[PDB]
Subunit: 200 residues, 8 copies
């Protein structure tokens, strides 16, 4: 093994939210701050009632001023299940290069940061120990996927993904709930790993 | 293994001539027909003295009228060495999709036809048991490589390949004699297989 | 005829199933194995009730364990009718380059392998004499057609083709039943041959 | 022949000057007018000593004021030889669509106007029965060839053609004297027709 | 006027049928042959009830065998009205390069062949003095317009034009009756000429 | 004249420096400050001895701190000669859309700002009445010309222009001294105006 | 600040009408001239009942002959509010390059001409002191935005903007009333400035 | 600061080696292992005597078997100087998005991993506690830069960069020694920081 030509490998992109974990940062924030307008805005954003970015920025503005420590504290509710680790490792076995993405913060989703071969999520701005706003590191997941316009993509996602993300993938798989653009539907992380281990 | 997603695999393209076999069809024809103008034209074509296609068509016109049986007879001088088979099988192990190409005829290079996952060479036209001309199935090897413009390509070739073929590859490897565009140089099929087994 | 410039020729792409043969591998398998869920999944898949790939992989999973010999035997129900041969030979007369495609297996559809100038279908995986799964050699037929994006395409297909395959062709012809995107509709292979002989 | 799908055919483009005719309009004007600066400028333009357009516009300005009729008489020196007609008709038989182009005037090259399937050359401006200037209908022959960028191109040309025109062709043939970009070299129109008749 | 840089000029494309003439070739043939299926098919093709090409080829097959002379006689019902000539000449005045196109035959629309700076229509096949079929010189008018993909286009058309032709134009003008894609609606050729004479 | 369709017009691009004015801002500043390193750097930048941007920024740093008033006073040495105005107005007459560009400052080249239909140059930074640096509004003139990638371009330039600017133009004209890429050479503004007045 | 690399900055494009000013030139002309058909046509054009260009040219034709001075007085109703100036200056502070665009006339919108870094609107034709017609300087706002296809775009617009303009933007913001394609909706210029100030 | 639109920011790409650190991993390894063939291969590779990848893989093969711990220990000679930190933080001030790249290992260059906004380098393969080979995560730095083809790029690099990396950047800055393609040359990191603080 004088070489692993990683750059020539096909890419497995996993949207972390709702595929590797049930944790939903904005619902947790809605609980913590008692502001149900946050979770209402989430619901509106997922249901396509309002434009995604609008809901996101409104929510971001809502939790503004929150303590840094309280914020990072939510990391403890995020966990790399052994099923998730199995999925990633299996994908590597089955010849893929694993890329994990999320709309949420890297600071919250830190356990996954070194799990896959590449990791991208948005970030948080902290002035004087208090939350100020969000660093939007990518426009959306579809646009982000343009980084691999030069290769092939197997995409796995849940209710935080959408058609645009899958219209970039060569093979698209939705988890739990159906998504326009996805080729297959599995019911849960289990079914998904069972599928992935049925490869090559 | 409910699925081998072959279409998402990176592609290993091998130019058969001078990498998997020492057989040179046109030199054999030059010997058989005693026309040294054929081999002279070959030499001129490789050395870039004359434009490749011109030399090729002149040679094609030179062996015109040759017997069908005599023609196909040269197949017996073509052999799938165990080193070659090892190379292909190893490439498949090391995650590639193997594509074999040649400027010569499929009818002569028939043993390799089912070796790799894809096979392309030019063909022969036979009217009344006599050789009439050539079916040019592709313009050149670089242009042919546009079939995989959507993925990555490791290219291995010898003196019948050129810069244009390698300018398409992400990683290019020349065998025996140096080629502009190639990233590496191995000395022989042995060294090449040794390299390939040092992968992933 | 010192040269046939096959690569400059316009391309006639034929979806084998339902144009060159009445044979439907999955229905046949439904008969052999008595698993009617196979033919039900096929029916659902064609009607777009379920996503094509999902139903397909389900069907593959249903026939898992079938004997290799029994599987390859299904080839015996596949035959190159003289009408098909006439169609292909006519297309060659009318200046086309014939490319045969199918979503089904090369192992079953082998008689057609040498009929056209190029042949592509998916393949079968056989571990320990028993059938394990499917090698998907192309993403779909439309995507496959990108191999000839540098020229023109006349596409002929039946119910295993769809809009995506035809939105690539410059001229599209549907066989038997109408397909969104197709320019013309013929009723069967005969009428299609009558059409093709009417060219130039 | 209920249909000729002409638009799907590969394109044979012939640069008229030095391939179908010995006629060189500018040398003729140089003789007619006794201005040898015209033929000198032509020589300079062909040899690439000075920019083509500079020489062309200089020559146009040189013959300015010339009589319309006197101008058009040069047509009488133009003849569609039976060899040329044979070339075109053979190309048609060998499946091509014929496009004739020239840098010179349509008014002079009128006999060729209906020979091929498409015809393009520059034109002449005539106000009050006298030659005023030139209507430049295409930038150059390479740029012109972009009209068929959606298909394949066999290009045949002589010393009024150049690299840019042939860098567009899939197959390039030079007539009489070799040109960078051309794939083949023939010695004359006869040899070229002999070549074309060795096709399919 | 040492130069008219025609190739740099913006292009004014006129769909001849129903803009420069009230003549409708297919209705005329329908009258001549008393076959109302021809005119019914015309109506169906325009209304998009059946695919355009299907209806067209049906009509071509319907009129098959008609006498050559009878066919060409229809030219006599086509006339370059002075209003049309005014339109074209004005367009040249207003800085345009005029290109005339139609789906009908050049043999019929001959008066228009030298009217504009470029002319394209489909053509007719005549074997042994009898009409055999049609040479389709372009796929459609929209596709045809790609010959000018490198510049700007003002497109004018009537009920034989459609949306695809106009989605290529930078400015689209409908005549008589509204068409999806067009920017403007004029009532007749007069109104259009008045519009064009109001330019620059 | 209900409309001037300016956006459909072909574009005439004039590099102001050395075409519309003999004024050279950097030489003037070099005289003013007695720093000959400025003019030496100008010479070096034009001759390609050192990279253009390097020399430019060196000059900018050289002149740093200069008084705002002293800087803008140089406007008084710039004049819209009546020949220049004639050129532009003629270009509009001859169907062009005139765009003026320069590497120098808008603040200096102000008379030209409303001359053509579009105007672009770089600008100056002034903090507390003293010159601080340069706002580079375009990367280079060639890159700038991409704003008109959708149409045609006649480009005219002098010794402050270069090849990259002209490889974008469909027709390029050099003034005074020859530049790689240009099609023509004129000797002065007069000759150029005479050329332009010889159009259409 | 020896350098401002302005060309590398992301672009903030503001559609002036309904974002920076309440001024609606066509309503103003409708009032001035008592032709209510003007404001009716405006309403129809905005609501997409009739094609934008049709309505625009109809309106232009409606106010034809109007006095130049009377026309320009409408400028006096135009004011660069301090909120607007604040918006632009903030955008500059938040790292953007500001481009102001409008469908209306530069002559009316002169106060805004030097506000942003780049300014584009359509223009007016005035022969003999009287309004004749309109110079259309861009096809539409979407097409205009192609000038910055090489970078990123934040677009802010109101009811004179549309989907095409926002489908070009990476981030779209509608002002006052929601527009398909826009990502966010603010209620007024104030809210928008408050948003912009929450950046970086 | 409710939002930082990082994705719309222009990108500053820094090749770490020879810009942010004097550390040269292969030379260090040459010291530790006393194998001077390593440093000889490096020298040959930089000078382009041998193809980069060939020399690289040779070097990898030389250091095969080295202890994992000893390898990772080399990190101790890598340190984020305060000048580097100043550069990155300044780039962020000056509106850039900082992307750190290297051909070397993440394991050695770990201190820089969290310095910029994005970090990419190649990795190490460790089987049974001993070093086996290299994971090539990108083809080369130029190819890597295609991740930001949708925006602008300021590239800073040293002797581990080359022309291909700079022919992608809109503005290129070389450090220490001149590189073909670079626009500017600085002598060391200090002068570069002095340059960067001079922006906007």
């Amino acid at each position: 093994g004088a070489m692993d030509p990683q750059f020539m490998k096909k890419v497995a992109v996993i949207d972390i939210e709702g595929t590797l974990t049930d944790f939903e940062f904005w619902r947790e924030m809605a609980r913590i701050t008692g502001k149900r307008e946050i979770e209402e805005l989430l619901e509106k954003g997922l249901s396509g009632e309002v434009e995604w970015l609008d809901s996101l920025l409104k929510r971001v503005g809502l939790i503004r001023g929150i303590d840094e420590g309280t914020f990072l504290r939510t990391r403890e509710k995020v966990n790399v299940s052994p099923e998730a680790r199995e999925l990633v490792e299996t994908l590597r076995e089955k010849g893929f290069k694993v890329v994990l993405i999320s709309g949420s913060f890297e600071e919250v989703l830190e356990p996954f940061k070194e799990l896959g071969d590449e990791f991208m999520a948005n970030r948080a701005i902290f002035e004087d120990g208090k939350f100020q706003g969000i660093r939007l590191r990518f426009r959306d997941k579809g646009e982000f996927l343009k980084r691999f316009r030069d290769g092939f993509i197997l995409a796995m996602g849940d209710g935080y993904a959408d058609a645009k993300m899958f219209e970039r993938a060569d093979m698209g798989i939705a988890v739990g709930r159906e998504i326009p653009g996805a080729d297959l539907l599995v019911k849960d992380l289990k079914e998904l790993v069972d599928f992935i281990k049925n490869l090559k």
